[PDB]
Design a binder for this molecule. Structure first.
Ligand SMILES: CCCCCCCCCCCCCCCCCC(=O)OC[C@H](COP(=O)([O-])OCC(O)COP(=O)([O-])OC[C@@H](COC(=O)CCCCCCCCCCCCCCCCC)OC(=O)CCCCCCCCCCCCCCCCC)OC(=O)CCCCCCCCCCCCCCCCC
Ligand SMILES: CCCCCCCCCCCCCCCCCC(=O)OC[C@H](COP(=O)([O-])OCC(O)COP(=O)([O-])OC[C@@H](COC(=O)CCCCCCCCCCCCCCCCC)OC(=O)CCCCCCCCCCCCCCCCC)OC(=O)CCCCCCCCCCCCCCCCC
Ligand SMILES: CCCCCCCCCCCCCCCCCC(=O)OC[C@H](COP(=O)([O-])OCC(O)COP(=O)([O-])OC[C@@H](COC(=O)CCCCCCCCCCCCCCCCC)OC(=O)CCCCCCCCCCCCCCCCC)OC(=O)CCCCCCCCCCCCCCCCC
Ligand SMILES: CCCCCCCCCCCCCCCCCC(=O)OC[C@H](COP(=O)([O-])OCC(O)COP(=O)([O-])OC[C@@H](COC(=O)CCCCCCCCCCCCCCCCC)OC(=O)CCCCCCCCCCCCCCCCC)OC(=O)CCCCCCCCCCCCCCCCC
Ligand SMILES: CCCCCCCCCCCCCCCCC[C@@H](O)O[C@H](CO[C@H](O)CCCCCCCCCCCCCCC)COP(=O)(O)OCC[N+](C)(C)C
Ligand SMILES: CCCCCCCCCCCCCCCCC[C@@H](O)O[C@H](CO[C@H](O)CCCCCCCCCCCCCCC)COP(=O)(O)OCC[N+](C)(C)C
Ligand SMILES: CCCCCCCC/C=C\CCCCCCCC(=O)OC[C@H](COP(=O)(O)OCCN)OC(=O)CCCCCCC/C=C\CCCCCCCC
Ligand SMILES: CCCCCCCC/C=C\CCCCCCCC(=O)O[C@H](COC(=O)CCCCCCC/C=C/CCCCCCCC)COP(=O)(O)OCCN
Lengths: 459, 56, 104, 140, 347, 69, 122, 55, 53
């Protein structure tokens, strides 16, 4: 695992020793090389995980997330360099350093064998994101957004720390292998109920769960493009990964402790899909769609079936890629017209046809068109829910209908109709933007040929 | 002719050297977990006439 | 002064196409821009996508699915060649299980 | 003094509602007296009579909260025939919160006090049931 | 003040603290406290002004009252047992007097009122000394008598200190009062674990002292004592502001920074003793300290506040006096989390 | 690909066995340490939690101007 | 609250008892020593940055002194820490040996004869 | 009604309001040693009675 | 917290005054010399926890 971590660390002195006009080129090239190297972790053994050492291990769940992070870094660099052109060399190097530190913390988080190290890195991811949002955000609400993002996370995460140290004291270990092999049932008691809550609420708020999701629109809208990319693509999946790791020791309590969370997730996915229908800001719609998809992931994790975990893993990967692509698409238009209002710029298909094609493909993947992996995950989760209870199909179908509705609503509003007359500064699409959209979309379609790479350990 | 281009492009070796060093450290870490080599009930084997270890 | 502060006016964003009609949107310097485009395209589309997809497609069957199919074929042949049931409702041997002696 | 807490806890849960209500009233009155003493010390009332009035209002509010909580909890426990149940303490805590809100004459204060006091009382009942320790002894 | 006189007074303060450290006799510990206070009073008044005079007077009154209570407790302990050694006090009443006395000396709640005012009324160097060196002696005394303390009173005072530190720091625009409330909260955290493990108290003391030294030195380097004055440092010394922001994040206890390790170790040690509720409340309350640290970081480094025209003249001048240990203190305040198992050397 | 980039399953299998043994031994040692600390703090008969008493070398065993000490 | 300060035969202010010499010294390439050296290098770089000097190249002798001092102190710190952990394990094992009635060895049952409750997931 | 008003009201806005009120209560002291030492006397009287009588 | 400089250097800075059975001038005994002598010799070297019981 050091063969991935050490080059990521080497990215720091390499970008701090580069010339003022070569930082983007060097960082992009070596980030792509690191992603290529990290692609070798997909070879999984089946029966058990790849245990490199006492500190790190790789699973069929961790490997797609690691590859997604390593692949997302170069796309973040490509998206960032346009709006940072006027910045000084030192501040651009600091921004790239923030991105590299975030990547390092993420790659170490997904491979830790022990839960305290996972917690330490999972909290350490906060600082670079907070710095990025509050320093390179564009509006004045970035400060309030950063405060929300920090405190919503910490209020859930601190009880997790207390629960983890208590569990290590009572059991003697927190190593995930020992945790799994020496699992014992949780009795029906108030102490066990509060232990369950302390082990669950941090990952709940990172998803986010409906009712604890208010930080996400603020943080995702007010962050720069790279910050939004990493928030939607990767940082939302930390909660799901933590849930999959932690629910091993929570049985059989989850059988009834999951009822309020399932109810909240289903009704709130309906609510957020409905909210997307009346939104004046283009980024907030994407944020709320992310909330709905993560609510579906929460249901999948809560029901505790192999098909549910497979669908949840597929949906996490697909949602990460699709949300990153949608955020980049919105950012291109924002850079054109310097406003996030959806109806300001209309009929962009007449002026930008290839970008309209990218918009159409992203909208089609957002509504989970077959045989894309988005629908693979969603269908697996829906089938698992149907096995859990036949009445879930009503809510699943309603959510599907509303998702198609607002996806095509966004597409029609932004791309169709007639152009706004007074707006006359819409230049032809750059090679960088088209390449960024292609690099987002092509892995999505290529993953359809080999769906088992992202289905997870339960495959 | 190569002095200046080396001085301005030497940064392109840091990441490959880090990769090589990481592989080397991974092998060293593997070297510390040989307690059960050729000792598992499933994979215990008779050594070949010339081989010294089952894996390294 | 009727003013609150000494501030630079907000400048107009400058079009990269104005000084470079074919500017690729990577950098102001045309040479650096061209090489940024070239390295991005080569290391993304040529190295990662195609070669990595080939590598993933030709990954060795470490998941033991062909092995599982062959083992299943052997077991099925052996079991229906002798009239034995294809599968037992008991995963583990009842003879190595010591249940509690009394149930009442 | 924790002797007041023991006099409250010596009485069984669903028995002798008047005695338990009296004990809770005494606890509330002591708490209100301490609060009023600190308030007078840190914020002078500019007159002896105004200080007496502030002490009276604080002590009466706290004693009323304690009385309502104890009476409601004991009555609910005995009527429902459900001792060792956090629901009785939650009901009593919300009753005390409504009492506080009526005293301050604020609907929002009343609702918030209901919710938080009831949750706290339910947590205290759970800790009594399962033996949670606030000021744990140094065992190791 | 004559530099020789100042050196003699600082050495006398340090020697009184060391006398408290090395004594086996209660009278010698009392003498060390008396000498420390006597040499400490002039240091608060080195730069003469009415505010410094008021701060020194309040400090003297508080510490003299604490010393009287200390001596009375020692005399009660002698009365109920003819012992002068500091091993374990034989009377609960004398021990309660001792605890109240040491808490008043440390500034624990509800004896916290003097700390913000005295800290605000003095210079930054005197504030550094008051908030770093003045904590060693009472904490050492409390460590020696740890087995005798009543856990209820100590833990109540610690929880009150944490809560009041957070709430008081929420309302401050002066940097010295912010640091004083931060000190109160950190003292509460330290005294919460003392009845269970004195090594945890020592580790928390070391880390808090390192962070406080780094913060005070950074505040001296950028000669500001208010939020708006510190808001100008970005236009003259951006590196100082960046280091300040990182140190503030460390003081908030965020991983993977150093300030997280004492809270982590204290929480796990308390959970070893079946104490779950109180550490949870403690962390949830330290969230407030993190909030006002983040407010200071917003106003100081993450955004750029408007500046004045005369800063151009300051641009042309370097710092005449340089602090030798500032670089080391910053590194120890931030990047020492991986070296956690070294705490075994403290016991 | 298997020959150039990977190894056999036996290496990972036995490395996993070694890791599991190390972790299980560490867990057992942690639990034993907690029990030993509890016992020494409760009883005081072990090397730990030894709180100082008065040194007997300070006593003066000489005649004291009075036969009855 | 004070575990090992009162341990018998403990000299007050040694920082390294003679019995510690029976333990293997940490290797000079110990990763913890490398981290201490990295901390010293960071201290040197921050010192250069504060004094408005070229961060990477200004003080080479000063950076060397920083790294050397950090490594030198860290070596002895690691020695003391390892010795303290060795003492902890030694005392624990001795106490376990001397009190068999508090750490009994009970016969362990195989899983075929231990009855575990099954909780179906549905 | 829900995201912009009530979900805001319950978790974050209530916390902000409560902490602001408590901070205003705690930090607004007149700076007079008379009140502080009166509170010190009150605290001493409590510790000797509610704590010193319980052992 | 407590650096025992006296024990390391064998100085006896203040240990002459800690107890009533320790070398008074002119051999003047304390009123409770024998009881304290007995209690000190009982509790010596066994630790504070055991000395109490
Ligand atoms: C493009 C730019 C714009 C954007 C691009 C966006 C795209 C980006 C892509 C990014 C990169 C992606 C990378 C992916 C890598 C994939 C590699 C891989 O996994 O390969 C797997 C696989 C290789 O298999 P293998 O595992 O190596 O097999 C080994 C066997 O054991 C043993 O095999 P064998 O012994 O049979 O050997 C056969 C041998 C020899 O076979 C023969 O020669 C015999 C054929 C019959 C000939 C008979 C007539 C001729 C002879 C007679 C006539 C002359 C004489 C008679 C004259 C008579 C005159 C009258 O040749 C072959 O092996 C087959 C050809 C393999 C080619 C693979 C190419 C993969 C390229 C990967 C990168 C691509 C990048 C894009 C660019 C690609 C380049 C343009 O390749 C294929 O899957 C080929 C698919 C064939 C499909 C058959 C038809 C199926 C139709 C079903 C659907 C029906 C409905 C309609 C559907 C229509 C769908 C089209
Ligand atoms: C089983 C346990 C039962 C529960 C016991 C524990 C829970 C006690 C809760 C105490 C709640 C305290 C906070 C209340 C609000 C603040 C005080 C206030 O003035 O409110 C006015 C507020 C009305 O607003 P307002 O007058 O318009 O406000 C004026 C301005 O806006 C703003 O007003 P202001 O600016 O004039 O504020 C007054 C002033 C004055 O500040 C205070 O009054 C602070 C009072 C703290 C008392 C703590 C009580 C703990 C009792 C322990 C003993 C328990 C024995 C049993 O504030 C300050 O100057 C700053 C205070 C902070 C500075 C330092 C504070 C630390 C001092 C010592 C703290 C406690 C140390 C204890 C000993 C430590 C020994 C190591 O409410 C009242 O009128 C008084 C009623 C308060 C509610 C009492 C509820 C009692 C419920 C008991 C139920 C029992 C059920 C039966 C169980 C079985
Ligand atoms: C070994 C350690 C132990 C040590 C402790 C032992 C100590 C023993 C020594 C005691 C022997 C006497 C020594 C003489 C000391 C000299 C004091 C002095 O110089 O006065 C300066 C001081 C100020 O001097 P100043 O500037 O010339 O006068 C300006 C005006 O005063 C101000 O001008 P203004 O009129 O404009 O201001 C308005 C007015 C405002 O005045 C007021 O608002 C206070 C009146 C509130 C009425 C209280 C409610 C009545 C019923 C409660 C009974 C509780 C049980 C109820 C059961 C259920 C009921 C159905 O005045 C004030 O603001 C002053 C407030 C201070 C009142 C007393 C301080 C006590 C703590 C504060 C809490 C207040 C009571 C709350 C309830 C607490 C629990 C009982 O004078 C006073 O404030 C009061 C006069 C002093 C005489 C009373 C002193 C006796 C108290 C000592 C301790 C109590 C007992 C100790 C142990 C008992 C158990 C063991
Ligand atoms: C976890 C695993 C490992 C991770 C490592 C840990 C993280 C990195 C290490 C941290 C400590 C190292 C660096 C600290 C001293 C640097 C201080 C500084 O300011 O740098 C300026 C300096 C550039 O200035 P210059 O070159 O003198 O000329 C330009 C002018 O000075 C013009 O400059 P200026 O001063 O006029 O510019 C003004 C600027 C000045 O503001 C700054 O420059 C920011 C400096 C903040 C100091 C960092 C805090 C202390 C360390 C704690 C780190 C916490 C990490 C945990 C995660 C939390 C993230 C915050 O102010 C602003 O623009 C406002 C920015 C405010 C935004 C908020 C972000 C600031 C805090 C971010 C800190 C992130 C960590 C450090 C990243 C690296 C920074 C250089 O940077 C450097 O050139 C040195 C960087 C490192 C180069 C040495 C590499 C060795 C060479 C290769 C050998 C290969 C070794 C292996 C062998 C392999 C075989 C081949
Ligand atoms: C906006 C989104 C925020 C996040 C949402 C988080 C959801 C948290 C809710 C937790 C789910 C349930 C918690 C515990 C399960 C059952 C709770 C209780 O009502 O059930 C009965 C419990 O009986 C009573 O109801 C006791 C609870 C009454 C006191 C609780 C107060 C509830 C009021 C609602 C307050 C809002 C809480 C959330 C604040 C934000 C069952 O009866 P019984 O079989 O005998 O007890 C079983 C437990 N035993 C085995 C230990 C005995
Ligand atoms: C713009 C102009 C468009 C018009 C031009 C279009 C030209 C034609 C387009 C249509 C092509 C259809 C191709 C159909 C597939 C043929 C090849 C296919 O069969 O191979 C697949 C191979 O697919 C790959 O295995 C999966 C793709 C891997 C994707 C990895 C992408 C690289 C990583 C990039 C970053 C990712 C970030 C997110 C990751 C989580 C399936 O392999 P499989 O049938 O089993 O192999 C059988 C034989 N084997 C096993 C011996 C090989
Ligand atoms: C847990 C115990 C539960 C306590 C119940 C009371 C909590 C009320 C908080 C909800 C908000 C309700 C509210 O309106 O707050 C206001 C209310 C004041 O009345 P106003 O509404 O501002 O006056 C209106 C005219 N100016 O706020 C307060 O003063 C109380 C704030 C402190 C709450 C208690 C916190 C105690 C923490 C320490 C515990 C140990
Ligand atoms: C930003 C929003 C996110 C909010 C998430 C907050 C919820 C976190 C879950 C509860 C936190 C506290 C959990 C405590 C840690 C668990 C450790 C444990 O299991 O110990 C219990 C201790 O259990 C407790 O003490 C729990 C009491 C609760 C203390 C604090 C209460 C605060 C409010 C709790 C309800 C809210 C939690 C869910 C709300 C989610 C957000 C709305 C039993 O230990 P023993 O004493 O040894 O008992 C067995 C031997 N007799």
């Amino acid at each position: 695992m050091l063969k991935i971590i050490i080059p990521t660390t080497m990215l720091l002195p390499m970008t701090w020793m580069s010339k003022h006009n070569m930082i983007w080129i060097n960082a992009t090239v070596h980030s792509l090389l690191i992603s290529l190297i990290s692609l070798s972790l997909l070879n999984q053994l089946g029966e058990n995980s790849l245990n490199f050492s006492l500190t790190f291990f790789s699973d069929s769940l961790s490997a797609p997330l690691l590859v997604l992070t390593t692949w997302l870094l170069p796309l973040m660099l490509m998206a960032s360099q346009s709006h940072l052109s006027k910045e000084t060399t030192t501040r651009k190097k600091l921004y790239i350093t923030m991105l590299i530190l975030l990547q390092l913390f993420l790659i170490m988080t997904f491979t830790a064998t022990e839960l305290i190290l996972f917690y330490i890195l999972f909290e350490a991811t906060l600082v670079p994101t907070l710095i990025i949002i509050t320093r390179w955000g564009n509006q004045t609400e970035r400060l309030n957004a950063g405060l929300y993002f920090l405190f919503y996370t910490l209020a859930g995460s601190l009880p997790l720390l207390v629960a983890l140290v208590y569990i290590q004291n009572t059991t003697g270990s927190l190593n995930f292998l020992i945790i799994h092999y020496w699992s014992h049932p949780l009795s029906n008691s108030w102490s066990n109920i509060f232990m369950w809550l302390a082990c669950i609420m941090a990952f709940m708020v990172k998803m986010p769960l409906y009712g604890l999701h208010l930080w996400l629109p603020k943080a995702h809208v007010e962050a720069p493009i790279a910050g939004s990319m990493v928030l939607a693509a990767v940082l939302l999946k930390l909660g799901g990964y933590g849930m999959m790791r932690i629910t091993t020791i929570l049985n059989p309590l989850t059988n009834y402790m999951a009822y309020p969370f399932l109810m909240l997730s289903m009704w709130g996915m309906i609510m957020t899909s409905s909210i997307c229908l009346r939104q004046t800001d283009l980024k907030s719609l994407i944020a709320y769609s992310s909330v709905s998809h993560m609510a579906l992931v929460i249901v999948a994790i809560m029901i505790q079936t192999p098909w549910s975990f497979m669908g949840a893993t597929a949906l996490m990967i697909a949602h990460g890629l699709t949300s990153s692509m949608l955020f980049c698409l919105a950012n291109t238009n924002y850079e054109r017209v310097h406003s996030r209002t959806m109806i300001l710029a209309r009929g962009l298909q007449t002026l930008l046809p290839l970008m309209a094609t990218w918009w159409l493909v992203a909208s089609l993947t957002n509504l989970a068109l077959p045989p894309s992996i988005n629908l693979i995950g969603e269908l697996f989760i829906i089938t698992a829910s149907f096995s859990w209870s036949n009445i879930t199909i009503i809510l699943m179908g309603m959510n599907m209908m509303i998702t198609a509705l607002y996806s095509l609503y966004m597409l029609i509003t932004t791309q169709r109709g007639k152009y706004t007359h007074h707006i006359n500064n819409i230049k032809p699409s750059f090679t960088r933007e088209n390449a960024l959209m292609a690099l987002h979309i092509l892995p999505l379609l290529l993953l359809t040929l080999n769906p088992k790479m992202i289905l997870g350990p339960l495959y | 002719n190569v002095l200046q281009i080396v001085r301005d492009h030497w940064v392109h070796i840091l990441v490959p050297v880090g990769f090589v060093f990481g592989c080397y450290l991974d092998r060293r870490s593997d070297e510390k977990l040989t307690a059960f080599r050729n000792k598992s009930l499933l994979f215990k084997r008779e050594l070949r006439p010339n081989e010294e270890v089952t894996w390294k | 002064p009727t003013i609150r502060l000494q501030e630079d006016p907000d400048p107009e964003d400058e079009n990269l196409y104005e000084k470079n009609p074919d500017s690729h949107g990577y950098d102001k310097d045309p040479i650096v821009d061209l090489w940024n485009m070239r390295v991005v395209f080569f290391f993304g589309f040529s190295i990662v996508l195609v070669l990595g997809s080939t590598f993933v497609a030709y990954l060795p069957d470490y998941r033991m699915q062909e092995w599982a199919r062959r083992e299943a074929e052997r077991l099925v042949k052996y079991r229906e060649a002798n009239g034995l049931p294809l599968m037992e409702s008991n995963c583990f041997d009842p003879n190595k299980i010591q249940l509690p002696e009394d149930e009442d | 003094a924790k002797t007041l807490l023991h006099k409250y806890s010596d009485i069984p849960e669903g028995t002798e509602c008047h005695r338990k209500a009296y004990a809770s009233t005494s606890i509330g009155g002591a708490t209100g007296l301490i609060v009023s003493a600190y308030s007078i010390a840190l914020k002078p009332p500019a007159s002896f009579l105004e200080g007496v009035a502030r002490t009276g209002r604080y002590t009466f509010t706290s004693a009323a909260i304690g009385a309502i909580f104890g009476l409601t909890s004991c009555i609910s426990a005995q009527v429902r025939e459900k001792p060792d149940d956090p629901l009785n303490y939650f009901i009593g805590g919300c009753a005390g919160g409504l009492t506080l809100g009526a005293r301050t004459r604020s609907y929002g204060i009343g609702a918030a006090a209901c919710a938080y006091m009831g949750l706290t009382a339910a947590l205290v009942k759970m800790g009594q049931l399962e033996g949670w320790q606030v000021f744990a002894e140094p065992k190791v | 003040m004559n530099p020789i006189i100042y050196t003699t007074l600082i050495m006398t303060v340090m020697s009184g603290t060391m006398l408290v450290m090395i004594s086996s006799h209660w009278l010698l510990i009392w003498i060390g406290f008396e000498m420390n206070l006597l040499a400490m009073i002039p240091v608060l008044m080195k730069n003469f002004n009415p505010r410094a005079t008021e701060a020194a007077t309040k400090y003297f009154l508080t510490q003299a009252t604490a010393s009287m209570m200390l001596m009375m407790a020692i005399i009660i302990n002698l009365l109920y047992s003819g012992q002068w050694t500091i091993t374990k006090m034989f009377n609960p009443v004398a021990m309660t007097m001792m605890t109240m006395a040491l808490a008043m000396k440390l500034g624990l709640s509800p004896f916290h009122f003097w700390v913000p005012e005295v800290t605000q009324g003095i210079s930054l160097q005197a504030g550094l000394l008051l908030l770093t060196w003045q904590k060693l002696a009472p904490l050492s005394v409390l460590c020696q008598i740890s087995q005798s303390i009543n856990p209820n009173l100590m833990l109540t005072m610690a929880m009150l200190s944490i809560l009041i530190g957070g709430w008081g720091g929420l309302n401050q625009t002066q940097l010295r009062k912010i640091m004083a409330y931060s000190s109160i909260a950190h003292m509460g955290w330290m005294t919460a674990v003392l009845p269970y493990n004195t090594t945890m108290t020592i580790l928390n003391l070391l880390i808090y002292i390192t962070m406080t030294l780094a913060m005070f030195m950074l505040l001296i380097h950028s000669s500001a004592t208010t939020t708006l004055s510190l808001s100008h440092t970005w236009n003259k010394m951006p590196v100082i502001t960046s280091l300040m922001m990182v140190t503030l994040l460390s003081m908030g206890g965020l991983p993977p920074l150093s300030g997280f390790m004492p809270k982590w170790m204290i929480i796990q040690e308390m959970t070893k003793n079946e104490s779950i509720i109180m550490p949870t409340l403690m962390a949830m309350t330290a969230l407030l300290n993190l909030y006002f640290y983040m407010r200071l970081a917003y106003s100081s480094s993450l955004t750029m506040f408007p500046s004045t025209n005369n800063m151009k003249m300051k641009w042309q001048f370097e710092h005449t006096k340089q602090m030798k240990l500032l670089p080391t203190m910053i590194v120890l305040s931030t990047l020492v989390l991986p070296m956690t198992p070294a705490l075994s050397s403290l016991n | 690909i298997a020959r150039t980039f990977y190894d056999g399953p036996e290496k990972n299998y036995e490395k996993t066995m070694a890791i599991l043994q190390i972790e299980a031994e560490k867990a057992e040692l942690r639990l034993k340490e907690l029990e030993v600390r509890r016992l020494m703090r409760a009883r005081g008969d072990g090397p730990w939690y030894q709180y100082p008493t008065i040194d007997k070398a300070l006593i003066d065993h000489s005649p004291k101007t009075t036969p009855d000490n | 609250m004070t575990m090992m300060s009162g341990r018998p035969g403990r000299v007050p202010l040694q920082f390294l008892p003679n019995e510690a010499r029976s333990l293997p010294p940490p290797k000079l390439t110990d990763p913890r020593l490398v981290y201490m050296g990295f901390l010293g290098y960071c201290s040197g770089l921050i010192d250069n940055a504060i004094r408005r000097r070229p961060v990477v190249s200004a003080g080479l002798h000063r950076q060397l002194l920083y790294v050397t001092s950090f490594v030198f102190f860290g070596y002895y710190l690691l020695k003391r820490q390892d010795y303290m952990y060795a003492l902890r394990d030694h005392d624990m094992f001795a106490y376990v040996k001397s009190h068999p009635e508090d750490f009994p060895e009970k016969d362990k049952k195989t899983y075929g004869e231990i009855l575990e409750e099954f909780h179906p997931v549905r | 009604l829900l995201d912009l008003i009530w979900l805001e009201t319950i978790l974050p806005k209530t916390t902000s309001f409560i902490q602001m009120k408590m901070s205003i209560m705690v930090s607004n002291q007149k700076g007079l040693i008379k009140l502080y030492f009166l509170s010190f006397l009150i605290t001493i009287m409590i510790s000797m009675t509610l704590f010193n009588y319980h052992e | 917290p407590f650096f025992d400089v006296q024990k390391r250097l064998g100085l006896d800075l203040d240990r002459w005054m800690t107890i009533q059975s320790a070398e008074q001038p002119h051999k003047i005994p304390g009123r409770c010399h024998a009881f304290e002598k007995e209690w000190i010799e009982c509790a010596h070297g066994i630790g504070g926890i055991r000395a109490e019981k």
